[PDB]
Amino acid sequence: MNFVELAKKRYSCRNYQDRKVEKEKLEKVLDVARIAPTGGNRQPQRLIVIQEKEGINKLSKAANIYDAPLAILVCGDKDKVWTRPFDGKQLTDIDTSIVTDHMMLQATELGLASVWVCYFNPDIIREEFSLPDNLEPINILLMGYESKIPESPERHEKTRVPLSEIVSYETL
Amino acid sequence: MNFVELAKKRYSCRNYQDRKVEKEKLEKVLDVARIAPTGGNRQPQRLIVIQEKEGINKLSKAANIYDAPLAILVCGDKDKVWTRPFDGKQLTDIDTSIVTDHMMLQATELGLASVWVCYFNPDIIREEFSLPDNLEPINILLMGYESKIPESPERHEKTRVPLSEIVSYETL
Ligand SMILES: Cc1cc2nc3c(=O)[nH]c(=O)nc-3n(C[C@H](O)[C@H](O)[C@H](O)COP(=O)(O)O)c2cc1C
Numbered sequence: 001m002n003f004v005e006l007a008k009k010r011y012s013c014r015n016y017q018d019r020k021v022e023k024e025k026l027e028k029v030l031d032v033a034r035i036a037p038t039g040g041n042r043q044p045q046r047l048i049v050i051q052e053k054e055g056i057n058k059l060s061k062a063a064n065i066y067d068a069p070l071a072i073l074v075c076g077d078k079d080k081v082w083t084r085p086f087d088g089k090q091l092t093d094i095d096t097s098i099v100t101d102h103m104m105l106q107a108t109e110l111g112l113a114s115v116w117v118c119y120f121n122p123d124i125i126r127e128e129f130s131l132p133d134n135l136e137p138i139n140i141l142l143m144g145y146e147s148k149i150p151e152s153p154e155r156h157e158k159t160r161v162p163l164s165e166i167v168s169y170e171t172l
Numbered sequence: 173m174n175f176v177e178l179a180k181k182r183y184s185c186r187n188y189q190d191r192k193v194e195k196e197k198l199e200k201v202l203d204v205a206r207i208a209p210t211g212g213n214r215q216p217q218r219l220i221v222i223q224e225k226e227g228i229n230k231l232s233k234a235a236n237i238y239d240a241p242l243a244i245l246v247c248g249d250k251d252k253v254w255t256r257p258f259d260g261k262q263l264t265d266i267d268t269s270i271v272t273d274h275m276m277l278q279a280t281e282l283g284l285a286s287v288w289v290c291y292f293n294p295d296i297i298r299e300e301f302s303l304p305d306n307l308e309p310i311n312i313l314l315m316g317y318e319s320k321i322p323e324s325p326e327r328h329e330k331t332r333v334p335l336s337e338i339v340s341y342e343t344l
């Protein structure tokens with residue numbers, strides 16, 4: 001069980017069982033959101049764990065969440081995030097994505113199916129979860145148990161472009 | 173050797189040996205940049221592997237790279253990236269960060285020290301590597317071998333805020 005095997009087995013699940021995510025597994029997923037690095041060690045991530053009816057219903061107003069039993073809304077705090085002196089670019093999406101990716105890989109190791117969701121209505125999320133102006137919703141990570149057929153760990157030959165199309169050496 | 177142990181051991185190295193990164197390890201790091209998911213499966217990541225003198229010198233014009241022996245410049249292609257219908261937000265930073273995080277964790281497993289770098293002059297990077305207007309430089313991942321004392325896998329009690337400060341349940 002090494003990293004590449006973990007990364008390959010992970011796939012996007014859009015078919016979830018009713019079966020709830022155990023608290024013990026959730027807590028291990030959350031631990032790695034703290035462990036992850038952020039620019040300047042600023043730690044701008046702000047997470048809302050959503051597994052109860054109201055919250056799940058609120059999310060379903062903003063996005064297709066495939067009846068997943070657990071969601072984590074990952075926001076970034078622009079009052080904490082590092083801002084690059086050259087151009088003013090803030091690391092909000094970068095820091096929060098490292099955190100989300102850590103959680104997604106940890107979920108996978110624990111046998112949880114998952115899908116990363118960015119196709120959500122941000123203004124609905126902001127209203128429903130009463131986000132103040134300094135928090136921006138970035139990613140929603142859904143997790144649960146696959147109810148149908150998982151995608152194959154060997155699928156990437158068909159589902160990704162060749163490495164040579166994304167990598168060059170020294171120059172473009 | 174599980175995921176949390178990997179995530180904890182990973183730290184930011186800013187003290188590198190002259191010792192080059194073996195090709196075999198580099199290729200395993202690159203493999204996971206392809207394996208990683210991207211929004212819409214659009215695969216907008218575009219990587220430049222930099223381990224030769226010119227390229228390293230070019231990077232050193234734009235950023236402090238701590239004499240690392242290997243760098244990967246991770247760009248995103250705005251002509252491929254998914255664009256959210258609600259607000260026009262592009263996933264450029266998100267997709268490229270998932271890719272970079274995958275590579276950083278894979279590097280760690282292979283015994284390579286690393287540091288993620290966003291404090292670079294983007295216009296210098298664009299000029300030096302002749303990036304066309306559709307590619308935006310997002311992250312520089314440095315890797316090599318630690319020359320001094322590694323940070324401790326148990327440091328997070330001191331180097332991170334408590335989990336309770338970044339996580340809430342159902343509501344803020
Ligand atoms: C940043 C990001 C945003 C995504 N947003 C959604 C989403 O809103 N809804 C969805 O069904 N899938 C979403 N996906 C899942 C992708 O469609 C999926 O990762 C990609 O097609 C590759 O498939 P795989 O993850 O099964 O390998 C997202 C993935 C990423 C990385």
Ligand SMILES: Cc1cc2nc3c(=O)[nH]c(=O)nc-3n(C[C@H](O)[C@H](O)[C@H](O)COP(=O)(O)O)c2cc1C
Pocket residue numbers: 037038039040041091094095098182183184185186287288289290291292323331
């Ligand atoms: C998105 C991002 C950008 C970063 N940019 C730089 C950088 O430009 N230079 C640098 O020395 N460290 C940079 N870092 C490293 C952080 O300072 C470091 O991850 C943080 O202080 C936590 O320390 P640790 O990684 O040792 O746990 C960056 C880290 C992240 C996640």
